[PDB]
């Protein structure tokens, strides 16, 4: 990667070059790749979502639809604005279920202002249906594509379907090497309003004049440099991720279920995932609405053992996301369940997916996993 | 400058984020440090861990940068701005008056140490203690500044440091939250990473943010801390050179006795005398206010710009900003006076005595 090279350039030419050179190049690279006409490099994907919600007009007490089977970072922005989240279970793609979504919009006494749709693990959600549903209901679509950069739906890049899209670049570890998020959107004015907010809402004056208040969300040039370096190898990395996914499927497909991506869609498989002792006939066990209360979810015996054994072999595997509708933080919020995300947590396993891995690495891991489940 | 060296190490493989926090603790003597994305984020978390809730009152410096007070808005708390004294910081009497007149007890005070200058800490610390007001020091521009040999930022329950100026887009980024209570600081740390419970899976009792600094920027922060003292000393030299060459027509207000301003940015006042201080005492319901720069200041800025030399007006007080329309502010007329007669001068540490002299020459020619 050109990370070091680019960072050296930042330091060396800082004294003479145009402002935010690499931030500008980072945004352009994302536009070229996604085909979005607007891009804003920010501190994180959470910050991108926060600005999207705000420029979309979300206010305290407004209703915002969201995926239950996701990472809290995708929905916390709803709390920042003191809006109310309504969670929806997922389907066979790991994303928001069409049926449950329609049911929720219908039974909502107050019409939701927007929907934050997560493309979990890089998988595309059923976009044609969801896009239409949001259009027919005057709901702003905000795509949480934090882990879906490189994923496509019918030759269209995830993130370009809604009014706003958000990409992330450095995984979910508590501390990472780099950081940053990119907010993209259809409306130039709205994206530029967000740009305005990302730098403390300064009016164009000789001194500091403020008609509104903003934030400190603008990405730095050093991280923008890393972003350009990462975008340069994105495609190659996505192909490698899918190679890794296909190898796992090849070595474990007998005992684990690897749910297919939508036809005419290309999941970036940013993280390989699989389900043990699973059958599609287990999906949609129920269809009920609830008021959230905390609940633990018991891991399938083979999964907890799998995680433990591979751990003693120095291989890191993890359970899938724990649905928001089971989290204490969202106690009292409305949620629609079909039982799918809890089943996925129960039988799911998240596998090592670093692109530096060779087929042998993926093979040794697969052998250890097979040895553990039998 | 170890930036590249450290960054290179980062790539060859949060080591540096931890080191960055340690370096701040070693420098400031604080027992707790938390590396974040920005100073604004640091202030945000300080206010939250402090217990500030919607509609609570938070006292704050009027003569400051909005980044310092936006956090109050984030929590939907109500700001009460206070004018400054001769240090550029919150005036002691206006602070007491504001406290005496508050409908209810303010939860906290965000005290800015403007341009690195120390505020009257013995008095303010006492005032906050006696009134049970959480003191949060906005030392964004004051890292390296001291009050009676004690580092600014370590007097309040919470302190905040920034590292890369306010250019709309900077090379690096970062902020540091320090504090006296380990538990409060660790709660902030908990919040800075999406409020994750320490479990294999993701469990949440509360919601948090993505405010944690990256390892790359942490490495840069370490490099910056290692040369901070050398920088401060140079900033102070530069300040003295300006006073030496411009002292005749510009006033360079002294730092508090026994204190040490890091003079991160050299500022001066034209045609000014201590006698015009505290000229307009009153409190208002904030309304946007346009303040015309002193003729010579606006001209000075224009002339230097023609010479490719950047200078800027001083901060425009919050009590004159439209965004805070309606909010209360206790004034004495100082921050507005400083705005009309003030100038922020080039303060790069790479500047030699000759460079400052030449810049001073152009200035003297501008004001003739």
XYZ file of C-alpha atoms in Angstrom:
742
model
C 0.000 0.000 0.000
C 0.992 3.613 -0.580
C 0.026 4.620 2.968
C 3.555 5.577 4.054
C 4.363 7.218 0.738
C 1.241 9.372 0.868
C 1.669 10.297 4.535
C 5.251 11.382 3.820
C 3.929 13.604 1.024
C 1.456 15.212 3.403
C 4.202 16.162 5.850
C 6.710 17.217 3.199
C 4.427 19.456 1.134
C 2.142 20.702 3.901
C 3.965 24.031 3.969
C 3.288 24.755 0.299
C 0.435 22.653 -1.100
C -3.304 23.342 -1.440
C -5.474 22.731 1.621
C -6.755 19.211 2.306
C -5.112 17.720 -0.765
C -5.554 14.102 0.321
C -8.991 14.695 1.813
C -10.050 16.003 -1.617
C -8.487 13.035 -3.379
C -10.107 10.602 -0.921
C -13.563 11.998 -1.670
C -12.952 11.933 -5.444
C -11.791 8.313 -5.305
C -14.997 7.312 -3.551
C -17.130 9.222 -6.073
C -15.288 7.571 -8.962
C -15.831 4.152 -7.399
C -19.421 4.504 -6.143
C -20.533 6.938 -8.865
C -22.110 9.196 -6.250
C -21.973 12.864 -7.220
C -21.170 14.012 -3.676
C -18.708 12.891 -0.994
C -17.686 14.206 2.437
C -14.710 12.727 4.323
C -15.382 12.692 8.078
C -13.939 11.353 11.380
C -16.087 8.232 11.313
C -19.115 6.505 9.836
C -21.083 7.284 12.994
C -20.380 10.976 12.434
C -21.470 10.577 8.792
C -24.781 9.082 9.944
C -25.218 11.864 12.523
C -24.881 14.604 9.870
C -27.122 12.705 7.444
C -29.892 12.502 10.041
C -29.520 16.186 10.877
C -29.498 17.563 7.318
C -32.444 15.249 6.625
C -34.420 17.235 9.197
C -34.549 14.682 12.021
C -35.489 16.359 15.313
C -36.002 15.323 18.923
C -38.852 12.798 19.225
C -39.006 12.069 15.486
C -39.173 8.406 14.550
C -36.235 6.705 12.809
C -36.452 3.133 11.496
C -33.303 1.007 11.917
C -31.872 -2.494 11.587
C -31.905 -4.544 14.784
C -29.216 -6.946 13.553
C -26.387 -4.408 13.333
C -23.656 -2.637 15.326
C -24.884 0.030 17.777
C -22.569 2.552 16.052
C -25.108 2.575 13.204
C -27.993 3.639 15.460
C -26.408 5.770 18.224
C -26.801 8.895 16.026
C -30.557 8.507 16.518
C -29.981 8.924 20.263
C -27.745 11.992 19.753
C -30.705 13.833 18.243
C -33.050 12.396 20.880
C -35.160 10.785 18.174
C -36.866 7.429 18.673
C -35.553 4.228 17.077
C -37.891 1.493 15.801
C -36.009 -1.759 15.181
C -36.725 -4.366 12.502
C -35.562 -7.989 12.376
C -33.741 -9.363 9.317
C -34.202 -11.826 6.459
C -31.993 -14.456 4.789
C -29.601 -11.716 3.652
C -28.932 -10.586 7.257
C -30.703 -7.311 6.494
C -34.037 -5.650 7.243
C -36.960 -7.898 6.330
C -39.408 -6.487 3.777
C -42.496 -7.912 5.498
C -41.562 -6.619 8.943
C -40.657 -3.221 7.485
C -44.033 -2.793 5.812
C -45.808 -3.991 8.959
C -43.922 -1.455 11.101
C -44.598 1.510 8.829
C -48.283 0.581 8.806
C -48.686 0.069 12.563
C -46.682 3.221 13.383
C -49.029 5.838 14.831
C -46.414 8.435 13.906
C -44.816 8.201 10.456
C -41.003 7.687 10.606
C -38.867 10.468 9.106
C -36.090 8.168 7.944
C -34.704 4.654 7.846
C -31.112 3.735 8.552
C -30.563 0.575 6.544
C -27.540 -1.544 7.391
C -25.915 -3.752 4.752
C -24.675 -6.289 7.287
C -21.315 -7.922 6.658
C -21.300 -6.362 3.207
C -24.477 -8.157 2.089
C -26.949 -6.161 0.043
C -30.520 -5.857 1.296
C -33.525 -6.207 -1.016
C -33.110 -2.711 -2.449
C -35.806 -2.527 -5.124
C -38.466 -3.295 -2.536
C -36.995 -1.205 0.286
C -36.343 1.773 -1.983
C -39.932 1.691 -3.254
C -41.356 1.301 0.255
C -39.391 4.352 1.426
C -40.460 6.367 -1.612
C -44.146 5.515 -1.288
C -44.024 6.438 2.395
C -41.979 9.636 2.112
C -39.219 8.124 4.245
C -35.630 9.288 3.788
C -33.392 6.312 3.022
C -29.972 6.397 4.704
C -27.737 3.474 3.806
C -25.393 2.283 6.514
C -22.811 0.744 4.196
C -19.991 1.005 6.747
C -18.948 -2.551 5.909
C -20.433 -2.624 2.406
C -18.024 -0.419 0.469
C -17.296 -2.531 -2.592
C -20.692 -4.242 -2.506
C -23.111 -3.851 -5.412
C -26.772 -4.454 -6.153
C -27.553 -4.928 -9.840
C -24.360 -3.139 -10.905
C -25.164 -0.232 -8.591
C -22.897 0.442 -5.594
C -24.517 0.035 -2.190
C -24.731 3.477 -0.641
C -25.968 5.127 -3.839
C -29.575 3.916 -3.477
C -30.705 6.222 -0.699
C -30.629 9.965 -0.246
C -27.472 9.329 1.779
C -24.867 6.601 2.030
C -22.098 5.967 4.550
C -18.850 4.025 4.230
C -16.279 3.125 6.882
C -12.708 1.925 6.389
C -11.142 0.287 9.436
C -13.209 -2.478 11.020
C -14.754 -2.525 14.483
C -11.856 -3.148 16.902
C -11.895 -0.928 19.995
C -8.718 0.753 18.685
C -7.571 0.824 15.062
C -4.574 1.913 13.005
C -6.520 4.445 10.947
C -10.041 5.865 11.132
C -12.587 7.747 9.087
C -15.911 7.636 7.346
C -17.349 8.955 4.111
C -20.792 10.499 3.730
C -22.189 10.422 0.181
C -25.546 11.644 -1.123
C -27.831 12.681 -3.997
C -28.430 16.277 -2.962
C -25.397 18.522 -3.344
C -26.921 21.191 -1.122
C -27.533 18.749 1.727
C -24.043 17.226 1.464
C -22.535 20.708 1.442
C -24.684 21.600 4.455
C -23.109 18.615 6.212
C -19.645 19.787 5.113
C -20.561 23.141 6.685
C -21.575 21.375 9.935
C -18.476 19.150 10.011
C -16.269 22.196 10.633
C -18.135 24.080 13.397
C -20.686 25.783 11.123
C -18.599 28.822 10.154
C -20.071 31.586 8.016
C -17.893 32.874 5.188
C -16.421 35.879 7.004
C -12.994 37.321 7.861
C -13.657 36.448 11.503
C -15.663 33.660 13.170
C -19.405 34.205 12.735
C -21.981 31.544 13.590
C -25.693 31.341 12.720
C -25.827 27.719 13.863
C -23.601 25.292 15.787
C -21.612 22.460 14.266
C -19.033 19.818 15.099
C -15.412 18.805 14.622
C -15.974 15.896 12.254
C -13.770 16.834 9.287
C -11.229 14.145 8.432
C -7.531 15.058 8.691
C -5.125 15.075 5.751
C -3.033 12.233 7.190
C -6.059 9.945 7.434
C -7.256 11.158 4.043
C -3.953 9.933 2.628
C -4.510 6.480 4.075
C -8.030 6.562 2.615
C -6.718 7.156 -0.903
C -4.210 4.327 -0.404
C -7.031 2.026 0.706
C -9.332 2.989 -2.183
C -6.526 2.145 -4.634
C -6.702 -1.532 -3.599
C -10.386 -1.779 -2.678
C -11.450 -3.826 -5.700
C -8.488 -6.190 -5.426
C -9.327 -6.620 -1.740
C -12.999 -7.328 -2.397
C -12.051 -10.055 -4.873
C -9.723 -11.536 -2.267
C -12.468 -11.392 0.390
C -14.785 -13.375 -1.878
C -11.969 -15.844 -2.632
C -11.574 -16.334 1.102
C -15.337 -16.698 1.461
C -15.443 -19.306 -1.311
C -12.597 -21.262 0.264
C -14.397 -21.408 3.630
C -17.513 -22.552 1.790
C -15.431 -25.195 0.025
C -13.912 -26.566 3.240
C -16.918 -26.158 5.557
C -19.991 -26.204 3.320
C -20.793 -29.729 4.484
C -21.563 -28.737 8.075
C -22.036 -24.961 7.847
C -24.600 -22.953 5.920
C -23.274 -20.088 3.812
C -26.279 -17.969 2.848
C -26.144 -16.822 -0.774
C -26.029 -13.166 -1.749
C -28.975 -11.696 -3.658
C -28.979 -12.746 -7.295
C -27.574 -9.917 -9.381
C -25.828 -8.478 -6.324
C -22.187 -8.641 -5.308
C -21.441 -8.835 -1.597
C -17.949 -7.626 -0.711
C -17.907 -10.391 1.912
C -15.822 -8.058 4.074
C -16.164 -10.689 6.793
C -16.902 -14.354 6.140
C -19.806 -15.737 8.175
C -21.501 -19.136 8.443
C -24.308 -20.914 10.330
C -23.999 -24.325 11.965
C -26.813 -26.918 12.049
C -29.012 -24.531 10.064
C -31.948 -25.067 7.717
C -33.840 -22.338 5.881
C -37.030 -23.798 7.359
C -35.981 -22.288 10.695
C -36.405 -18.757 9.388
C -39.381 -16.576 10.292
C -40.249 -18.561 13.399
C -42.454 -15.659 14.503
C -43.841 -12.234 13.613
C -44.444 -10.083 16.665
C -43.908 -6.498 17.776
C -42.507 -5.797 21.237
C -41.197 -3.126 23.566
C -37.540 -3.959 24.103
C -36.234 -5.431 27.363
C -32.727 -6.874 27.767
C -32.241 -10.541 26.975
C -29.215 -12.821 26.714
C -28.927 -15.256 23.824
C -27.402 -18.690 24.312
C -24.812 -19.688 21.745
C -25.245 -23.072 20.092
C -22.921 -25.479 22.010
C -20.811 -26.105 18.917
C -20.300 -22.380 18.358
C -19.133 -21.544 21.886
C -16.874 -24.593 21.804
C -15.657 -23.599 18.327
C -14.731 -20.120 19.541
C -12.941 -21.598 22.563
C -10.961 -24.255 20.680
C -9.830 -21.975 17.856
C -8.837 -19.539 20.594
C -6.444 -22.105 22.069
C -5.059 -22.397 18.553
C -4.557 -18.626 18.427
C -7.232 -18.179 15.751
C -9.770 -15.451 16.471
C -13.423 -16.171 15.677
C -16.428 -14.279 17.036
C -20.190 -14.498 17.405
C -22.319 -12.419 15.048
C -23.825 -9.095 16.124
C -26.255 -9.187 19.056
C -29.539 -7.641 17.883
C -30.451 -4.214 19.244
C -33.916 -5.408 20.257
C -32.241 -7.465 23.005
C -30.028 -4.646 24.372
C -30.701 -2.877 27.692
C -29.758 0.501 26.185
C -32.858 0.371 23.975
C -35.180 -0.757 26.745
C -38.671 0.407 25.848
C -38.147 1.115 22.142
C -40.404 -0.551 19.553
C -39.103 -3.578 17.639
C -40.511 -6.075 15.119
C -39.206 -9.629 15.249
C -39.404 -12.737 13.097
C -36.788 -14.505 15.205
C -34.117 -14.493 12.510
C -31.370 -12.318 14.012
C -31.490 -14.157 17.349
C -31.210 -17.486 15.528
C -28.249 -16.172 13.557
C -26.493 -15.092 16.749
C -27.279 -18.508 18.163
C -25.826 -20.544 15.278
C -23.532 -18.008 13.614
C -19.755 -17.638 13.583
C -17.635 -14.766 12.222
C -14.444 -16.037 10.558
C -10.959 -14.471 10.080
C -11.067 -12.624 6.767
C -7.814 -10.696 6.399
C -6.848 -10.422 2.729
C -3.252 -11.198 3.678
C -4.398 -14.774 4.337
C -3.418 -17.449 1.840
C -5.594 -20.394 0.841
C -3.508 -22.480 3.245
C -4.330 -20.193 6.154
C -8.032 -20.533 5.381
C -7.549 -24.279 5.072
C -5.762 -24.806 8.393
C -8.503 -22.803 10.100
C -11.235 -24.837 8.410
C -9.591 -28.076 9.524
C -9.468 -26.925 13.149
C -13.138 -25.942 12.983
C -14.184 -29.317 11.573
C -12.203 -31.020 14.328
C -14.041 -28.997 16.963
C -17.630 -29.594 15.811
C -17.166 -33.372 15.678
C 10.291 15.135 14.568
C 9.590 11.426 15.004
C 6.194 11.498 13.261
C 7.180 9.449 10.223
C 9.346 7.154 12.333
C 6.479 6.413 14.708
C 3.927 6.142 11.883
C 6.249 3.740 10.098
C 6.368 1.653 13.283
C 2.581 1.769 13.451
C 2.361 0.234 9.994
C 5.015 -2.428 10.585
C 2.746 -3.069 13.580
C -3.176 1.185 20.189
C 0.403 1.188 21.444
C 0.913 4.830 20.479
C -2.508 5.964 21.702
C -1.479 4.638 25.136
C 1.940 6.270 24.845
C 0.327 9.560 23.840
C -1.825 9.503 26.995
C 1.214 8.610 29.110
C 3.220 11.505 27.668
C 0.455 13.942 28.623
C 0.317 12.505 32.136
C 4.111 12.797 32.431
C 3.971 16.365 31.165
C 0.905 17.664 33.041
C 1.122 15.377 36.082
C -2.566 14.448 35.731
C -3.333 10.878 36.855
C -5.791 10.199 34.030
C -5.667 10.773 30.264
C -7.894 9.781 27.347
C -6.910 10.315 23.692
C -9.833 11.344 21.469
C -10.667 12.631 17.954
C -10.983 16.239 19.076
C -11.094 18.725 21.948
C -14.787 19.266 21.252
C -15.309 15.532 21.742
C -13.284 15.734 24.965
C -15.496 18.537 26.258
C -18.620 16.641 25.150
C -17.640 13.576 27.192
C -16.567 15.697 30.180
C -19.984 17.372 30.327
C -21.783 14.041 30.015
C -19.750 12.203 32.634
C -20.195 15.299 34.803
C -23.948 14.674 34.751
C -25.082 17.523 32.496
C -28.600 16.801 31.185
C -31.049 18.570 28.895
C -31.980 22.021 30.225
C -29.202 22.054 32.815
C -27.259 25.318 32.926
C -23.600 25.377 31.919
C -21.481 28.493 32.487
C -18.948 29.300 29.771
C -16.384 31.774 28.510
C -17.796 34.224 25.974
C -14.424 35.190 24.520
C -13.628 31.852 22.914
C -13.990 29.533 19.906
C -17.462 27.999 19.417
C -15.883 24.522 19.333
C -15.507 24.936 23.085
C -19.194 25.453 23.796
C -20.976 23.463 21.082
C -20.995 20.445 23.467
C -23.486 22.336 25.644
C -25.828 22.395 22.623
C -25.217 18.690 21.965
C -26.720 17.879 25.350
C -29.410 20.522 24.936
C -28.185 22.338 28.033
C -28.477 26.115 28.406
C -25.342 28.280 28.113
C -24.638 31.373 30.210
C -21.703 33.354 28.815
C -19.254 35.448 30.834
C -17.067 38.329 29.600
C -13.304 38.539 30.232
C -10.724 40.396 32.318
C -7.234 41.568 31.372
C -6.017 37.994 30.867
C -8.573 37.432 28.059
C -10.334 35.021 30.399
C -13.547 34.955 32.442
C -13.769 37.891 34.839
C -14.059 36.811 38.485
C -16.745 39.323 39.450
C -18.949 38.613 36.435
C -18.709 34.905 37.265
C -19.872 35.382 40.853
C -22.628 37.739 39.729
C -23.887 35.213 37.168
C -23.889 32.519 39.832
C -25.674 34.773 42.324
C -28.435 35.539 39.802
C -29.063 32.070 38.356
C -32.622 30.763 38.640
C -31.136 27.370 39.465
C -27.642 26.090 40.256
C -25.377 25.721 37.201
C -24.008 22.183 36.847
C -20.685 23.148 35.334
C -18.356 25.790 33.977
C -16.309 25.469 30.791
C -13.368 27.790 31.364
C -11.282 28.687 28.329
C -7.609 29.637 28.691
C -7.537 31.927 25.663
C -4.426 32.074 23.496
C -2.709 30.044 26.209
C -3.068 32.673 28.956
C -3.934 31.399 32.415
C -7.173 32.552 34.047
C -7.245 33.573 37.739
C -7.255 29.996 38.983
C -7.102 30.423 42.765
C -10.282 32.543 42.646
C -12.170 30.514 40.029
C -11.324 27.139 41.568
C -12.576 28.449 44.909
C -15.735 29.922 43.398
C -16.588 26.608 41.733
C -15.832 24.618 44.883
C -17.950 26.833 47.137
C -20.873 26.596 44.701
C -20.543 22.901 43.867
C -19.908 23.683 40.199
C -17.930 21.150 38.161
C -14.899 22.896 36.671
C -13.921 21.831 33.158
C -10.835 23.511 31.710
C -10.814 24.157 27.979
C -7.036 24.253 27.566
C -7.227 23.500 23.845
C -4.680 26.246 23.109
C -3.122 26.150 26.581
C -1.118 22.912 26.647
C 2.254 23.993 28.001
C 0.757 26.853 30.003
C 1.132 26.917 33.789
C -0.367 28.693 36.801
C 1.966 28.813 39.824
C 4.017 26.007 38.241
C 0.919 23.821 37.912
C -0.191 22.818 34.405
C -3.381 24.431 33.125
C -5.986 21.736 32.627
C -5.239 20.043 35.963
C -7.106 22.512 38.189
C -10.591 21.436 37.174
C -12.330 18.106 37.573
C -11.630 17.839 33.840
C -9.104 19.361 31.481
C -8.897 19.428 27.700
C -5.979 19.780 25.265
C -5.926 20.146 21.472
C -3.057 19.627 19.032
C -3.471 21.010 15.533
C -4.881 24.506 15.352
C -8.064 25.491 13.593
C -7.264 25.432 9.886
C -10.459 24.097 8.255
C -8.532 20.901 7.410
C -5.325 19.939 9.221
C -2.500 17.467 8.707
C -3.279 15.642 11.918
C -6.008 15.782 14.518
C -6.621 14.892 18.125
C -7.722 15.957 21.551
C -6.973 14.784 25.062
C -9.289 14.571 28.045
C -7.552 14.540 31.438
C -9.147 14.480 34.864
C -8.827 13.939 38.599
C -11.272 11.043 39.003
C -10.129 7.764 37.486
C -13.654 6.380 37.436
C -15.067 9.419 35.599
C -12.250 9.313 33.038
C -12.661 5.592 32.490
C -16.411 6.150 31.977
C -15.525 8.688 29.284
C -13.172 6.110 27.725
C -16.084 3.632 27.852
C -18.250 6.179 26.009
C -15.559 7.001 23.444
C -15.791 3.482 21.986
C -19.552 2.914 21.545
C -20.192 1.938 25.183
C -19.208 -1.726 24.818
C -19.487 -4.044 27.822
C -16.388 -6.174 28.290
C -17.870 -9.303 26.676
C -16.855 -11.486 23.729
C -20.000 -10.362 21.919
C -21.511 -6.870 21.767
C -23.622 -5.933 24.806
C -24.793 -2.397 25.622
C -26.262 -0.832 28.755
C -25.896 2.629 27.268
C -25.065 4.299 23.957
C -21.734 5.943 23.215
C -19.707 7.484 20.404
C -16.794 6.894 18.068
C -14.425 9.432 19.624
C -11.353 7.263 20.157
C -8.124 8.412 18.553
C -6.490 6.164 15.947
C -3.038 4.639 16.429
C -1.632 6.695 13.526
C -2.716 10.035 14.964
C -1.645 8.776 18.370
C 1.888 8.307 17.035
C 1.866 11.891 15.769
C 0.593 13.054 19.160
C 3.540 11.392 20.903
C 5.992 13.113 18.554
C 4.286 16.429 19.277
C 4.434 15.975 23.043
C 8.137 15.121 22.932
C 8.916 18.537 21.452
C 6.145 20.505 23.170
C 8.436 22.200 25.692
C 10.910 23.250 23.001
C 7.960 24.669 21.054
C 6.537 26.608 23.984
C 9.911 28.213 24.706
C 10.167 29.300 21.072
C 6.594 30.661 21.066
C 7.544 32.733 24.093
C 10.675 34.011 22.346
C 8.602 35.012 19.333
C 6.153 36.786 21.629
C 8.973 38.791 23.213
C 10.390 39.735 19.815
C 7.015 41.141 18.782
C 6.825 43.063 22.051
C 10.359 44.347 21.439
C 9.651 45.611 17.930
C 6.001 46.661 18.341
C 5.748 47.450 22.053
C 5.625 51.164 21.293
C 2.298 51.118 19.429
C 0.766 47.807 20.549
C -0.115 46.553 24.021
C 0.957 43.041 24.983
C -0.937 42.336 28.207
C 1.134 40.543 30.836
C 0.509 36.957 31.830
C -0.650 36.535 35.437
C 2.144 36.816 38.021
C 3.789 33.435 38.638
C 2.086 31.935 35.593
C 3.489 30.978 32.219
C 1.420 31.454 29.097
C 2.513 29.131 26.307
C 1.879 32.108 24.008
C 0.780 29.604 21.374
C -0.485 32.558 19.353
C 0.976 36.043 19.789
C -1.713 38.719 20.027
C -1.586 42.471 20.565
C -3.890 45.476 20.967
C -3.544 48.720 19.012
C -4.041 52.189 20.577
C -5.035 50.569 23.867
C -4.704 51.567 27.518
C -5.739 49.673 30.654
C -8.075 52.583 31.414
C -10.638 51.490 28.809
C -11.166 48.147 30.554
C -14.505 47.371 32.256
C -16.139 50.320 30.497
C -19.559 48.798 29.757
C -21.074 46.711 32.546
C -24.363 44.896 31.965
C -26.088 41.603 31.160
C -28.153 40.869 28.064
C -30.444 38.457 26.282
C -28.059 37.617 23.437
C -28.654 39.073 19.971
C -26.315 38.938 16.953
C -24.017 41.942 17.008
C -21.705 43.270 14.335
C -18.502 44.798 15.655
C -16.473 47.014 13.358
C -12.740 46.438 13.588
C -10.596 49.415 14.570
C -9.654 51.136 11.266
C -5.961 50.331 11.747
C -6.565 46.639 12.466
C -8.658 45.996 9.374
C -6.053 47.881 7.337
C -3.184 45.999 8.983
C -4.788 42.688 8.035
C -5.277 43.827 4.440
C -1.751 45.182 3.974
C -0.089 42.042 5.331
C -2.336 39.847 3.184
C -1.095 41.732 0.141
C 2.360 40.656 1.301
C 1.199 37.052 1.609
C 1.386 37.342 5.413
C -1.581 35.931 7.330
C -2.988 37.590 10.456
C -6.552 37.390 11.780
C -8.949 39.192 14.118
C -9.216 37.807 17.646
C -12.116 35.500 18.510
C -15.571 37.084 18.180
C -17.316 36.541 21.529
C -20.218 34.083 21.759
C -22.586 36.704 23.176
C -22.552 38.435 19.767
C -23.291 35.278 17.790
C -26.703 34.632 16.205
C -26.630 30.941 17.140
C -26.865 31.866 20.826
C -29.753 34.291 20.378
C -31.738 34.580 23.608
C -29.103 33.040 25.876
C -27.877 35.105 28.814
C -24.491 36.833 29.014
C -22.791 38.951 31.708
C -20.554 41.599 30.161
C -18.089 44.323 31.069
C -17.241 45.332 27.504
C -13.786 43.766 27.397
C -14.119 40.911 24.887
C -15.764 43.269 22.370
C -13.078 45.907 22.876
C -10.346 43.294 22.418
C -12.038 42.180 19.223
C -12.033 45.651 17.706
C -8.463 46.546 18.698
C -6.830 43.130 18.529
C -4.671 41.264 16.064
C -3.458 37.668 15.992
C 0.107 37.544 14.637
C 2.102 34.903 12.723
C 3.503 32.584 15.384
C 5.155 29.674 13.583
C 8.052 28.281 15.628
C 10.172 28.042 12.473
C 10.343 31.859 12.451
C 13.689 33.489 13.223
C 14.187 36.762 15.039
C 14.747 38.387 11.633
C 11.489 37.048 10.246
C 9.569 38.514 13.185
C 11.441 41.798 12.769
C 10.615 42.023 9.058
C 6.979 41.216 9.789
C 7.026 43.872 12.495
C 8.454 46.384 10.025
C 5.567 45.890 7.592
C 3.155 46.269 10.500
C 4.733 49.510 11.689
C 4.527 50.776 8.106
C 0.875 49.768 7.850
C -0.142 51.720 10.937
C 2.509 54.228 9.863
